[PDB]
Design a binder for these strands. Structure first.
Lengths: 302, 229, 300, 236
DNA sequence: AGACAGGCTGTGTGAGACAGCACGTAGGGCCCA
DNA sequence: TGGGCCCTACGTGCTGTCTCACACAGCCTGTCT
């Protein structure tokens, strides 16, 4: 008789469990139609993430605030030492493709390129707290805006800026990942070879600094960078080779008849779709200042 | 064994999450008690988005030192504060969405991003260095050399450093340059005499290492930093 | 006309499918597998077979069983043209599921660059490769959707005939799922300093495990083998498990002992972050040149 | 697009089989392939797999009984590696064919032994396969005290190692050049891993100055980046 | 050289097999007596 | 020192999805008049 009594008792708990989970599923601040279809594991994950975020926020001490999300050109992430996106802004789908309820609580080492795990671990570990590095995030959004199945998703490069928070010790890193706009799907433009010699320059270069583009083709640019930004740009070029889309810092570009101009480079590599290997490196440069200290000559070419 | 392992994986997936929630809430109990106490905590905290606008702006200004301008109070802690931008950038501002320019803080650069509705936010982002070719001909000279040796950068370009050095040390300088080229990027420090504009000999140290292309590893030039001691 | 064109399409598929059906029969495969193979798989198997035959023509059975690894063949392009049938014992992926596929489809994305450098053409090779594994600790199989990674110690020589690389991939045993007199175990912290040691260390070199805790290991390494050991430890950090080549590590009263280390990083089941490093140091030789002193530690 | 990539793969496979046949329409190309198959259940035979094993690693096959340790049979592949013949191995044991120090090590036994050249032996219970001074190195700390010198320094500068340990290089350096060595050490400390070269004068055991050029770079910890020591290559 | 039949290619549709989610069932301890 | 209550691991049912081939319509080519 012992076998049949246990089944009724065992079935009793499961019935009580479902209503408790349904109550917990409904307690999550989500639309009612979403909580109904949510399975148990997702309810657990979202509840844990929400509780962690609430614990962090309560340890930290009007219509203009709502405009931040659409104005800011990125989506806010929050990462702990574990590697869990305990909070993602609801506009992640617009830039990254994936949807908030799918991502929140998952491991950040899963939804990024496997070759950025080491950089993620180094940046997450913990004395300056500023962080600025490039992270390749899985993207399910096609170029035409169609949402496409995750099992064949492609990688996307994001420029991450944020701080490490030690909140009473448990540590969270608050990242703002921004997308790098591809130059074919959008100050002067340009284009370079795979081993970084000039191969094309926009005619706007003539007015800014006096350089004639026909002279620039065939010459490596490393003779034009100021000597004080050689290692910075070398690290940026290593990022270019390793990932594909990078952004430079403020560095000096030498003019023709004297001085230098401060420019910022948003350079993206382009792959030949026929054979899937790099062919050319496309750069977009942002000039932000005129010629400074033109009265002196700094280079042999100048 | 495919289906059985998934159930084992899912149960461990659920079991670990059960343990994590209990630690998360201050208030080991049984599973049903854990979920019931969690539901009680949610009911306490329920008074449809994960975070409010105030919390979101707190996160934004903690992650990046930004302020909202169409202004917000967060301008003072960072900026210490067409007329507010650089006079030469007024043409760029008139035509301007994303733009990088300089605003009043001595000028500081401000990175602004936004969309036209214009709503946008502003987020903050004794030695001279010279270049020589493979044989040592001056290619680039920095302003810091005027206080180092007194020679203007123009008078140094096009002339080899060995000619600028003492005749006795010219063989050692040639050997060191050959060594620098051969080592492929290992810095070398060499003590030698540098002549000034007044012909006065000063003891100088040379840190010259070859610069290779990040992709092709081609020797572009040699970066030479010199310290006077 | 169009109906005849439609019938021609059905007619051409009948001969298209019949040749595929009989082509699989000739391949030396089990009949229960050959009849169930689709067109892509049978074409890949035939191409790979023909490539192996072309390579070959241009007590015996105990050779495979004695090895603790599986012989692996790669072309210049990365075709997995041949795998010994004992692959299912280690990775769980059967030979028919692997033969002909590109090696870049069954390798961690960060080992592709090392693969390209090692395949490009000394001829000896020695590298660590993260190949997909479908075995749990209990020996259960699992589909690709949840396959885990395993590090394989790959050794082989590139031969030029068409050029292919013959590899022998071996697993690195997990020290927690395995130690005679000449071999001991030790555990280090993240910063590679001694944190625990086996009781067999004292008779080998004279070290007392009491003061070892907290001291970095890099002091005890010989100065000559610092760069090779640094590269191998960096490989340990990147890939998870390495088998360091022979190196010299100093004793207490003098001399040196050749020691090969199979380091193994340990991850917590809760955080997926590194916790500690376990190294099973194999001492092969005794102290040589005892009368000589080498380092400040040896002076004390 | 998924269907498109299948036919692209299929056409590439069709193209691939076109080249490899010793001797058009897809049906006829498959017919030629299967005709060659008829002219031409494992992909390799025993001898082919043995040849692949021999090519992959410079190893040999040997079997020794565990009861007595006597050698029963060895392969012909031992000679190209160990430069030893089969006749000597036949009629003997394994104990006398290995290093005396490892005689007891193999008694307990996947093990490592030297026969000297290290031989990596792997097998199961016995079937097994056997598989194969003008400058001195030195160490320093941040302040520059000698923490390690290899025995090669005897051939380079004439000093035994005991006479260099504990004494800083600057104190061992010439008083005229004391500042330069300190500057170089500070330089390599702040460069964080960049190899640097400096030429100076070294006082040998017989107290005469001689030219010396070193290559120093700080050993940073691969994980915590803490400076462990400095490796110098002193080339004479 | 233009039209006809045949070969080669691009896209949508149908089905056996398999992965996920969840529940019924029995196997071990839990504190008590 | 007496067996009941209750907690937890496993096989099974149902559902949605994956990948394979089948078939049709369109483009390019050899051949006949």
């Amino acid at each position: 008789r012992r076998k049949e009594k246990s089944r009724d008792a065992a079935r009793s708990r499961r019935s009580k469990e479902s209503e408790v989970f349904y109550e917990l599923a409904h307690q999550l601040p989500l639309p009612h139609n979403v909580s109904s279809h949510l399975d148990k594991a997702s309810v657990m994950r979202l509840t844990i993430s929400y509780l962690r975020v609430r614990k962090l926020l309560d340890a930290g001490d009007a219509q203009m605030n709502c405009f931040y999300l659409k104005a800011l050109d990125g989506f806010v992430m929050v990462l702990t030492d574990d590697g869990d996106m305990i909070y993602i802004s609801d506009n992640v789908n617009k830039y990254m493709g994936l949807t908030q309820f799918e991502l929140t609580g998952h491991s950040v080492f899963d939804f990024t390129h496997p070759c950025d795990h080491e950089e993620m671990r180094e940046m997450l570990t913990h004395q300056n707290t500023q962080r600025s590095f490039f992270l390749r995030m899985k993207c399910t959004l096609t170029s035409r805006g169609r949402t496409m199945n995750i099992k064949s998703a492609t990688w996307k490069v994001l420029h991450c800026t944020g701080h490490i928070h030690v909140y009473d010790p448990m540590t969270c890193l608050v990242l703002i990942c921004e997308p790098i706009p591809h130059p074919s799907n959008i100050t002067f433009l340009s284009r370079h070879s795979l081993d970084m010699k000039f191969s094309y320059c926009d005619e706007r270069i003539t007015e800014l600094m006096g350089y004639e583009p026909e002279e620039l083709l065939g010459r490596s640019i490393y003779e034009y960078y100021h000597a004080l930004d050689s290692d910075h740009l070398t690290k940026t070029h290593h990022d270019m080779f390793t990932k594909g889309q990078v952004t430079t810092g403020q560095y000096r570009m030498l003019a023709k008849r004297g001085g230098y101009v401060w420019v910022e480079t948003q350079a993206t590599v382009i792959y030949n779709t026929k054979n899937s290997q790099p062919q050319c490196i496309v750069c977009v440069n942002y000039v932000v200042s005129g010629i400074i200290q033109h009265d002196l000559i700094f280079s042999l070419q100048q | 064994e495919n289906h059985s392992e998934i159930e084992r994986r899912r149960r461990n997936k659920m079991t670990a999450y059960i343990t994590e929630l209990s630690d998360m809430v201050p208030t080991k109990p049984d599973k049903l008690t854990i979920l019931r106490m969690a539901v009680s905590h949610m009911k306490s905290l329920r008074g449809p988005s994960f975070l409010t606008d105030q919390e979101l702006k707190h996160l934004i200004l903690e992650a990046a030192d930004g302020f909202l301008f169409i202004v917000s109070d967060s301008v003072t802690p960072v900026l210490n504060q067409y007329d507010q931008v650089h006079p030469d950038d007024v043409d760029k501002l008139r035509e301007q969405r994303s733009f990088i320019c300089r605003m009043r803080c001595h000028f500081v650069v401000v990175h602004c991003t936004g969309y036209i509705k214009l709503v946008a936010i502003g987020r903050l982002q004794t030695e001279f260095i010279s270049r020589h070719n493979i044989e040592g001909i001056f290619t680039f000279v920095d302003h810091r050399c005027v206080a180092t040796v007194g020679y203007q950068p123009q008078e140094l370009l096009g002339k080899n450093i060995v000619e600028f050095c003492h005749p006795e040390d010219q063989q050692l300088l040639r050997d060191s340059f050959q060594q620098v080229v051969k080592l492929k990027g290992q810095v070398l420090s060499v003590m030698f005499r540098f002549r000034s504009k007044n012909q006065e000999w000063l003891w100088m140290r040379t840190s010259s290492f070859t610069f290779q292309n990040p992709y092709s590893d081609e020797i572009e030039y040699i970066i030479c930093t010199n310290t006077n001691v």
